[PDB]
Every structure is written in structure tokens, then in C-alpha cells.
């Protein structure tokens, strides 16, 4: 059945266990977070600078911007992995906001296990420029984590945190957690 209990460890932050993983949500500025991986939600050319991608590319810096466009011209990518630049992370994984969100999160989880990473921070992927519906996005993100746990794949990954720009989108994620709790 996988799901633990929803609680609030700090004001406006909510968490629950999904198997061995602690899943958390909060509102705020993702560029101020520390994690092994931070996720960007961008366009198919990996050069968008609007919404979360503006915040991430401006903070990360020009060397990360250049790395993205260099990889984009090399081959056709569903996502790319760069350094962290001046963000507080080891790598940034840049996913395409218009793509299937469950598929994108599954890829992020698998890449983090390959690097023996423990912590991930992501935005509400697809809800900005791509204009996917928040309720479908929340369902997809949490389903990806459930499938990863069900397959026995969680080994190094211990914490997955969604830091969300709009409080109204945070409310959608909280309701989805309550629906699933043990
Ligand atoms: C993926 C959803 C998204 O873009 N969210 C977002 C994050 C930060 C800022 C400043 C604006 C935003 O709209
Ligand atoms: Cl988006
Ligand atoms: Cl967001």
C-alpha cells in the first residue's frame, strides 16, 4: 500500500513517506534550495528563460546556459544533465515541460540512482510555459515515485521535495497527498 501519513514539519511544508522515501511539498523559490539534483522545466531546445527556467538559468549562470545549447545541438534529447553552476546542487536535470510528466520524473529518479544521489528538488513540472493542468501534474509526479518504490528501485534516493511557485498549486499537491495517505 506504500503510503504513510501526511504531517507538517515546518509552517507551510508537508511531508509523507512513500515506501522508504520522504516526499515533501512547500511553496517558495526553488533557486534557494540545496539538493544533489535540482530539476528545470524547459522547452524542447533547452534555452527557455521564462518562469522557473528564467530563475534557474539566471542563478546557475552563463556556463550552464552554454552547456544546455551545446548538448541540444549534438543530438535529439528527451532531457539533459548539466553541472549546477552557482546553484546549491551537484547537477541540474533539464526536462521538457510539455512531455509526459510521469515519464520525466521516472527518468530523473533513475539518473539519481545511477549517481548514488540521495536528494532531489523539483518544481511543478509542466504547469508554467507548457500549461498542463496542476491536478494531472500532481497525480503524475506522485505516481512516478510510487512505481519506482514498487519496482524495488529506491536504494540511494531518500528525499524528493517539490518547491512550488503558486500557493494555489501547492494546495492541489496537498489534497493529492491526503487522498493517498495510509
Ligand atoms: C514549472 C512551473 C513554473 O514555471 N513555475 C515558476 C517557478 C518560478 C518562477 C519565478 C515562476 C514560475 O512560473
Ligand atoms: Cl512548464
Ligand atoms: Cl512551480
Swiss-Prot record:
Q: Explain the induction of this protein.
A: Up-regulated by IFNG in macrophages. Down-regulated by IL4 in macrophages.
Regarding how it is modified after translation, the entry says:
Auto-ADP-ribosylated.
Expression sites by tissue: Expressed in macrophages.
Its transmembrane ranges are none
Give the source lineage, highest ranks first. Eukaryota, Metazoa, Chordata, Craniata, Vertebrata
Q: Where is the Macro domain?
A: 10-181
Function recorded in the entry: ADP-ribosyltransferase that mediates mono-ADP-ribosylation of glutamate residues on target proteins. In contrast to PARP1 and PARP2, it is not able to mediate poly-ADP-ribosylation. Has been shown to catalyze the mono-ADP-ribosylation of STAT1 at 'Glu-657' and 'Glu-705', thus decreasing STAT1 phosphorylation which negatively regulates pro-inflammatory cytokine production in macrophages in response to IFNG stimulation.
Query: Where does it live in the cell?
Result: Nucleus; Cytoplasm
Give residues annotated as binding a glycoprotein 3.
Answer: 29-30, 41, 52, 126-130, 165
Domain of life of the organism in this record? Eukaryota
What is known about its subunit structure? Interacts with STAT6. Interacts with PARP10. Interacts with PARP9 in IFNG-stimulated macrophages; the interaction prevents PARP14-mediated STAT1 and STAT6 ADP-riboslylation.
In Swiss-Prot or TrEMBL terms, this protein is called Protein mono-ADP-ribosyltransferase PARP14
The entry sums up its family as follows: Belongs to the ARTD/PARP family.
